[PDB]
Amino acid sequence: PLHSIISSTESVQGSTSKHEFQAETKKLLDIVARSLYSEKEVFIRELISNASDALEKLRHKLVSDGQALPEMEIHLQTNAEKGTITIQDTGIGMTQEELVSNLGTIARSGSKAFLDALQNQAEASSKIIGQFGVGFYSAFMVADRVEVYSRSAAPGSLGYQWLSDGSGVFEIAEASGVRTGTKIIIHLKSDCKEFSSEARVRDVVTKYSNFVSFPLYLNGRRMNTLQAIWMMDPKDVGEWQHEEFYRYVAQAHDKPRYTLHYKTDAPLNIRSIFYVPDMKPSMFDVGSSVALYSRKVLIQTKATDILPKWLRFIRGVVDSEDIPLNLSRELLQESALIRKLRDVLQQRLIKFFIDQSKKDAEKYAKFFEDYGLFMREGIVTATEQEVKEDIAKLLRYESSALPSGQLTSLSEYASRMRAGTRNIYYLCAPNRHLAEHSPYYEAMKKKDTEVLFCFEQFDELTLLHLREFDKKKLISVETDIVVDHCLSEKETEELMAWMRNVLGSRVTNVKVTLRLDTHPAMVTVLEMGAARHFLRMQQLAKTQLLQPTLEINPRHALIKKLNQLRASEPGLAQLLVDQIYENAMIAAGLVDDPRAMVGRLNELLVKALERH
Amino acid sequence: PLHSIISSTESVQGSTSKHEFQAETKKLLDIVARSLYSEKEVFIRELISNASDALEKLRHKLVSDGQALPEMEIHLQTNAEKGTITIQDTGIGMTQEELVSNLGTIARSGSKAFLDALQNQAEASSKIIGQFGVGFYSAFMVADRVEVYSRSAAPGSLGYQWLSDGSGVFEIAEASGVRTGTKIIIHLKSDCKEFSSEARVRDVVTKYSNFVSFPLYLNGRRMNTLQAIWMMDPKDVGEWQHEEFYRYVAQAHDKPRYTLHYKTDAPLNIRSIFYVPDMKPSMFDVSRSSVALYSRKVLIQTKATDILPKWLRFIRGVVDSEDIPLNLSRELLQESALIRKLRDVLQQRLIKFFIDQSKKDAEKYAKFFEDYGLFMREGIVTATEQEVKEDIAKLLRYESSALPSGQLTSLSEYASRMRAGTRNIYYLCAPNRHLAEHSPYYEAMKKKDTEVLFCFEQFDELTLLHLREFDKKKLISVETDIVVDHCLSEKETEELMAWMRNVLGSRVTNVKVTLRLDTHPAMVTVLEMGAARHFLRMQTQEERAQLLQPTLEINPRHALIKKLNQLRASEPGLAQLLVDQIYENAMIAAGLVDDPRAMVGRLNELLVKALERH
Ligand SMILES: Nc1ncnc2c1ncn2[C@@H]1O[C@H](COP(=O)(O)OP(=O)(O)NP(=O)(O)O)[C@@H](O)[C@H]1O
Ligand SMILES: Nc1ncnc2c1ncn2[C@@H]1O[C@H](COP(=O)(O)OP(=O)(O)NP(=O)(O)O)[C@@H](O)[C@H]1O
Ligand SMILES: [K+]
Ligand SMILES: [K+]
Ligand SMILES: [Mg+2]
Ligand SMILES: [Mg+2]
Secondary structure, rough: OOOOOOOOEEEEOOOOOOEOOOOOHHHHHHHHHHHOOOOOOOOOHHHHHHHHHHHHHHHHHHHHHHHOOOOOOOEEEOOOOOOEEEEEOOOOOOOOHHHHHOOEEOOHHHHHHHOOOOOOOOOOOOOOOOOOOOOOHOOOOOOEEEEEEEOOOOOOOOOOEEEEOOOOOOEEEEOOOOEEEEEEEEEEEEOOOHHOOOOHHHHHHHHOOOOOOOOOOEOEEEEEOOOOOOOOOOHHOOHHHHHHHHHHOOOOOOOOEEEEEEEOOOOOOOEEEEEEEOOOOOOOOOOOOOEEOOOOOOOOOOOOOOOOOOOOEEEEEEEEEOEEEEOOOEEOOOOOOHHHHHHHHHHHHHHHHHHHHHHOHHHHHHHHHHHHHHHHOOOOOOOOOOEEEHOOOOOOOOOOOOOOOOOOOHHHHHHHHHOOOEEEEEEOOOHHHHHHHHHHHHHHOOOOOOOOEOOOOOOOHHHHHHHHHOOOOEEEEEHHHOOOOOHHHHHHHHHHHHHHHOOOOOOOEEEOOOOOOOOOEEEEEEHHHHHHHHHHHHOOOOOOOOOOOOOOOOOHHHHHHHHHHHHOHHHOOOHHHHHHHHHHHHHHHOOOOOOHHHHHHHHHHHHHHHOO | OOOOOOOOOOOOOOOOOEOOOOOOOOOOHHHHOOOOOOOOOHHHHHHHHHHHHHHHHHHHHHOOOOOOOOOOOOEEEOOOOOOOEEEEEEOOOHHHHHHHHHHHOOOOOOOHHHOOOOOOOOOOOOOOOOOOOHHHHHHHOOEEEEEEOOOOOOOOOOOOOEEEEOOOEEEEEEEOOOEEEEEEEEEEOEEEEOOHHHHHHHHHHHOOOOOOOOOEEOOOEEOOOOOOOOOOHHHHHHHHHHHHHHHHHOOOOOOOEEEEEEEOOOOOOEEEEEEOOOOOOOOOHHHHOOEEEEEEEEEOOOOOOOOOOOHOOEEEEEOOOOOEEEOOOOOOOOHHHHHHHHHHHHHHHHHHHHHHHHHOOOHHHHHHHHHHHHHHHHHHHOOOOOHHHHHOOOOOOOEOOOOOOOOOHHHHHHHOOOOOOOOOEEEEEOOHHHHHHOOOOHEEEEEEOOOOEOOHHHHHHHHHHHHHOOOEEEEEEHHHHHHHHOOHHHHHHEEEHHHHHOOOOOOOOEEEEEEOOOOOOOOHHHHHHOOOOOHHHHHHHHHHHHHOOEEEEEEEOOOOHHHHHHHHHHHHHHHHHHHHHHHHHHHHOOOOOOOOOOHHHHHHHHHHHOOOOO
């Protein structure tokens, strides 16, 4: 049954009254003080941002008036005796009306009003941080009573006072002896007395607001001691600062091997810089020091992964003034602009690596040898076909049709290949000597088609997952053999019948091949790539057999000896085939742990040499 | 640069005034509707929670006076052409005064006053969700006009109207014929018309508000059809209830091989359930903690806290509590102190439970250990505290030489029968039982009357070196202890020994003799065998052997070694091949070969000439 009661019988007949939305202050203050910020160390960051905004406002006003610029700086005082923290700046300052309209009203900020009266919003709107208006009340989260002493920068403004305990009541009075600017006095709570020490304050200042645009003083000394090189032009920063900055963000002692200075403004504002370490990636390498900034203050998201996961081996910093933020000044989760930011960064980073090989191929070879693991991971974990192909341009392989010791790409491979050819062949082997001596490649010697050699691990899996490059099918050499379209015939036929009976449980069928010269036998299976992966995966973990085919080579010297061995030592003949069968399995790559074949090997040896 | 402008010259001189804090409603509404919630689909959950709170208030009012209990229902309606969504409720209802006090004021909730004026906080304080007072204002985030009809259930209340354009100004009127309860009419935004589709709303409801304590309906039919079993006592839930509950949570139609119903209050109020799938794990299980946190019967959607450790990701269930502090965005305060202690308590509770399951049923635990054995091994290598290592080591089932084939034993029961004054435990690695028994290393320690453990699973040699201790006992591998511990004619032996230094000097640095072997012609002993095995696979014979120090020991009583003497001078060419085969065989037996594909060629040409005389 459809238990529905919705109707449209509601009737409106009276005269509608008009009211205005109200607001309750005590609950809002409690919410801000208790259940808004996860950490308790953000109030100093908010105060520093406010001081920077005030200093910027004063500088802009003086520039507009064209007067003499005085000294402007921010001072932090840490007094551990009374258990108090004090911050003082030299900004514009606020009069009684401004104090009442700003410090006494929730969700009200004068910075937005000032920006609305700029008529350009480009000269100073890129440096104002405050946008909500509830950042000051984070002081009550660690304080019980607050004192504010402010005097405006106007020639004739008097000092004032601002007393409040954070309980919905505040008072204002006129003061004397107050200098130009503002001075915030904070009385620390009982459980929050850790913030009255210099070490913790210095740590938080260095973590959050290290790159403030104005001098910052704590008990006399200055903490910034560094420039934000991601906001400066590339023509104004030297090569020496590019290394010192890298050693700071990466927390290392080496030099970077690459340096990208990206700066774009058309799709969205990006001011970023990236580095690649000289040293080889370690085990721990398998936010990745890509900390996100906004108006030169740390955001500390570390979870949204603004950079792709496979690109976790690079360091640097990213700045953007258009990213949306929570009320707690934290990054929004999976915003529309955030997804677009990740795509833009990935496209530029891949393009940068392509030009590096085009400029200096020798340097790129060393980079690919060390960091090549990360590129293979990206293709496997990708979900869009165009993403896989774009990343695949960075792969390097060496082919049989070229001298040993040089690497080729999948792009130029499609250029020198014949127009009649349409698919790409690849053979996997531990080395190149084994690859050319591999029995699978020996059958391909008849055709002149060019093949690529894959040596490193996961190359076979990476090629299988890609499955297509530039509309060209990727097919392995092993799969193309089963699909491909001395020992007279009479004496040959009975020899297989003696193997089918013995190896019936292992060798499902045996057929005579004519394309082998060196290896006595081969093992062929349809899904060779999957078999070489599934078998290695099962021994890798007990998670959620097959039918192999063996082909003998009549022209082989050992196979010729099998005719005269059965009629003389039938016992020795059985062990010999059990050794040839496992030898073929090892060459194919379907070999299990080889500890079990030692017993059959030593026993065969001690009986096969008792003739000398 | 010690120059500080900080001083204390400033002081108060004039009279002090007095002022009251104010607020800006428009900016507050903009913040709530634009920069508060990450995802735009939370308004349905908020309004459903409000309806549930109203129904709870009505239920308390109707049970307090001891009167009959009418029907409580939630009705969701959708209209594609109109682009409107309707959620009608039959709760207490609100008159003009409650409407203007609660709806018309930001951060004002009547539930908190109702909760505090309860005087008992026993039956209703645990089922009230709203505590902030800004939940209703999330409707403006998706709607261009909000229209609400409501009337109280009091004997004499009348219907009313409520309109708001989202511009900070609302309006109230009087209405007749309004059904008792609350009815919310929402007109959707132009770009937010995707919420007028039945499938998307069904997804939102089945994601956020599955376990509401009242029957809810969507377009006529019921969407709940399932009760929350973790709230009741374990005696009130049956096996068939568990199967359906495990089916929904884990999306698996099989039977849960394990079931735990944790209920603790001394550290903090916890009401959680757990499950273990019967099927075998796959990559989707291994690939990334599959447990959804709950609080007062509503989804919280943590997705980042990971309340359970990484190695315990193979279990499924839900976790509920009422003492978790969540911020204004209805999400947990990240890295909170109270959150950290929940992870450790839950981990150790499950550690004890798995120990218990072994006692009452060893066969069931043994089958369970084989299926998920990677997860316990994974936790040991990823743990930092030594105390936790012992808690996990009790869950490992190994096999020793004191029992026949196919009887697994634990470390604790292994260490209860070992020697008196020596703190040593012996473990050996082999793919099978036959290989372990015939391993040359085991044959070397057969002299002593000591017990040795045979572990057959992979990555187990790495676990025993990371654990490093078990109740103050040193873990020593069989291969390592051989080095630590301190026929053929002599003349023919030493000259035979001297040849290998001449022909294997590049690959062998020292050759010795062992008399304790009688079934293997070769043996390789290394100082740190366990470390070499795991470090070799992650990272041709010359540079490999340089970092392994492959000491070679040859049994002189083996028949193969004896025949090498009479083949020394008859054909030196074949002798160069057989000695290499012995060297290669020893490495294969020792398991220190990265890939045996290179040794096939040398072996293949040996057989073609070994029996050519036949
Ligand atoms: N040190 C200061 N000097 C001058 N004005 C200040 C100072 N600190 C705060 N204000 C004023 O306080 C008002 C709002 O304070 P605040 O709480 O910081 O909001 P906001 O910083 O503008 N926005 P946000 O910090 O992002 O929440 C504005 O009018 C500021 O000009
Ligand atoms: N449908 C409703 N029926 C009855 N009372 C309601 C209804 N919706 C809202 N109210 C009342 O109006 C108040 C304001 O709504 P709301 O913003 O959800 O507050 P809250 O839910 O208690 N706290 P929060 O968790 O932020 O939603 C509620 O606390 C209720 O007292
Ligand atoms: K303010
Ligand atoms: K409200
Ligand atoms: Mg600010
Ligand atoms: Mg609510």
